[PDB]
Amino acid sequence: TTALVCDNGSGLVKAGFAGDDAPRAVFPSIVGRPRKDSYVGDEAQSKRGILTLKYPIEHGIITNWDDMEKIWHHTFYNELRVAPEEHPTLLTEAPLNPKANREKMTQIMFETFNVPAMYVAIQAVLSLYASGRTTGIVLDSGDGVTHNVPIYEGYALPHAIMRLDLAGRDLTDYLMKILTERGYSFVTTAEREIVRDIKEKLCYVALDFENEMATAASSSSLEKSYELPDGQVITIGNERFRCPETLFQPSFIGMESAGIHETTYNSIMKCDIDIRKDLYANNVMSGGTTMYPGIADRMQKEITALAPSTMKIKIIAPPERKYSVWIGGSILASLSTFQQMWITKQEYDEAGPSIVHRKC
């Protein structure tokens, strides 16, 4: 009688029970590359080698089905301690997830895990839905991918979805590079975890990048310090905002795509002119990588600069932003008018993997 919601991210699995406010488990979306045989999730925070760290979802898309099964297995049995047979299951997908892909998911959910029912929602639509909305444009930025997703009346407009393979994982690698440039050495995969933490702990987005560079050069006000596990404490200076500045200038990292303000604009512009006002007023941020202090204000400034000067521009950055995909799923899976939406074992047995396209 109680639905599971499981949000499958490039780097983190967010899992739990519909009707709850937060997921119950969140854990790493990793398994194992062997020489008992393989440890899954937060348990592979152990033998990460020579039984090594593998990522079954990359850039939002499932590509290693075998390790995906194991992630799901772990979710149900090791993490949520429930029986998949006993619970309708809402799963999330990336924007522009291929049909083929959505069907493999369904088939496996029904045949391997024997769920009574299931549904797949677009991750961005649920974020929008978490903040009471059905029209809006979502910046979803996680670990492996970032999207701009315009949505009108609960529908994503697939032709206007922007995709950047630039996100939190690349931001940690880059913090590693620049901190190394300062005379530290952060290069190993273990060290990669400490810089993730430094990133989450001390980075921010300058309202004016060139100005922040000048402040940091001419005074000391912007330095913060950080204790490593071995008790060494390091200093961190302009790396603090240089790191997430990459989101606006992918060239910091050698990338030549547009930045997140530009893909936002592009996305809006590929939409038809009658809905644009609605989109500018309803820019929702979600995903761990939109967590930087300053980012909403910075986005506000950049979009103001590109948009017509008569435009009302609102950036919505909920404090729960990093679980808002999950939360939207909790809200949906409990919504009563949502109950006719589930796909039952029965309907799957009749119509096959293909029923998963209903029209929402």
Partner 1 sequence: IERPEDFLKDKENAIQWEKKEAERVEKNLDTLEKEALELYKKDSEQISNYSQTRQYFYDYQIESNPREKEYKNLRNAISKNKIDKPINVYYFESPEKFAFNKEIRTENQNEISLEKFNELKETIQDKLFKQDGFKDVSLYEPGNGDEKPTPLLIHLKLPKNTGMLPYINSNDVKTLIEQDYSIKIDKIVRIVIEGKQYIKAEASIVNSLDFKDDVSKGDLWGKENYSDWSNKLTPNELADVNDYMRGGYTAINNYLISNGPLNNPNPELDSKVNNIENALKLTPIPSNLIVYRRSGPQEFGLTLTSPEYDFNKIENIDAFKEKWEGKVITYPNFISTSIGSVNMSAFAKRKIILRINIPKDSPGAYLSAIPGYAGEYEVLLNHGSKFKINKVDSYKDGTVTKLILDATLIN
Ligand X SMILES: C/C1=C/C(=O)O[C@@H]2C[C@@H](CC[C@H](C)/C=C/C=C/CC1)O[C@@](O)([C@@H]1CSC(=O)N1)C2
| CB 247 to partner 1: min, Å | 14
Is there binding between residue 58 and ligand ATP (CB under 6 A)? no
For partner 1, the closer of residues 126 and 162 by Cβ is 162
Give residues 154-173 in contact with partner 1 (rule: CB under 8 A).
162-164
Scan for tokens 């590693």, then name that residue. 176
- Given candidates 3, 5, 9, 68, which one binds Ca ion under the rule CB under 5 A? 9
Is there binding between residue 100 and partner 1 (CB under 8 A)? yes
Give the per-residue SS3 of 138-196. EEEECCCCEEEEEEECCEECHHHCEEECCCHHHHHHHHHHHHHHCCCCCCCHHHHHHHH
CB 291 within 8 A of CB 322: yes
Q: Which residues pair with 163 in a beta bridge?
A: 147
User: Distance from first CA to last CA of the chain, Å, rounded?
Assistant: 23
Q: How many CB atoms lie within 10 A of CB 345?
A: 15
Q: How many CB atoms lie within 10 A of CB 308?
A: 8
CA distance 55 to 11: 8
Is there binding between residue 142 and Ca ion (CB under 5 A)? yes
For partner 1, the closer of residues 31 and 164 by Cβ is 164
- Given candidates 4, 10, 31, 91, which one binds ligand ATP under the rule CB under 6 A? 10
Stretch that binds Ca ion, among 7-15, 41-49, 229-237, 293-301 (CB under 5 A): 7-15
Cα distances (angstroms) measured from residue 121 to each of 116, 154, 168, 266, 282: 17, 11, 23, 24, 20
Is there binding between residue 28 and Ca ion (CB under 5 A)? no
Give the helix/strand (H/E) hosting 235: strand 233-236
Is there binding between residue 261 and ligand ATP (CB under 6 A)? no
Is there binding between residue 357 and partner 1 (CB under 8 A)? no
Give residues 163-202 in contact with ligand X (rule: CB under 6 A).
168-169, 172, 192-193, 196
Is there binding between residue 74 and ligand X (CB under 6 A)? no
CA distance 171 to 186: 14
- Given candidates 30, 198, 206, 315, which one binds ligand X under the rule CB under 6 A? 30
CA distance 94 to 81: 26
Judged by beta carbon distances under 5 to 8 A according to partner kind, the member of Ca ion, ligand ATP, ligand X, none in contact with residue 200 is ligand ATP
CB 19 within 8 A of CB 330: yes
For ligand ATP, the closer of residues 186 and 348 by Cβ is 186
What is the pattern of x (binds ligand ATP, CB under 6 A) and - over residues 312-331? ----------x---------
**Residues near partner 1, by CB under 8 A:** 58-59, 61, 63, 96-101, 162-164, 250-251, 254, 256-258, 262-263, 266, 269-270
**Residues near ligand X, by CB under 6 A:** 11-12, 28, 30, 42, 45, 53, 143, 168-169, 172, 192-193, 196
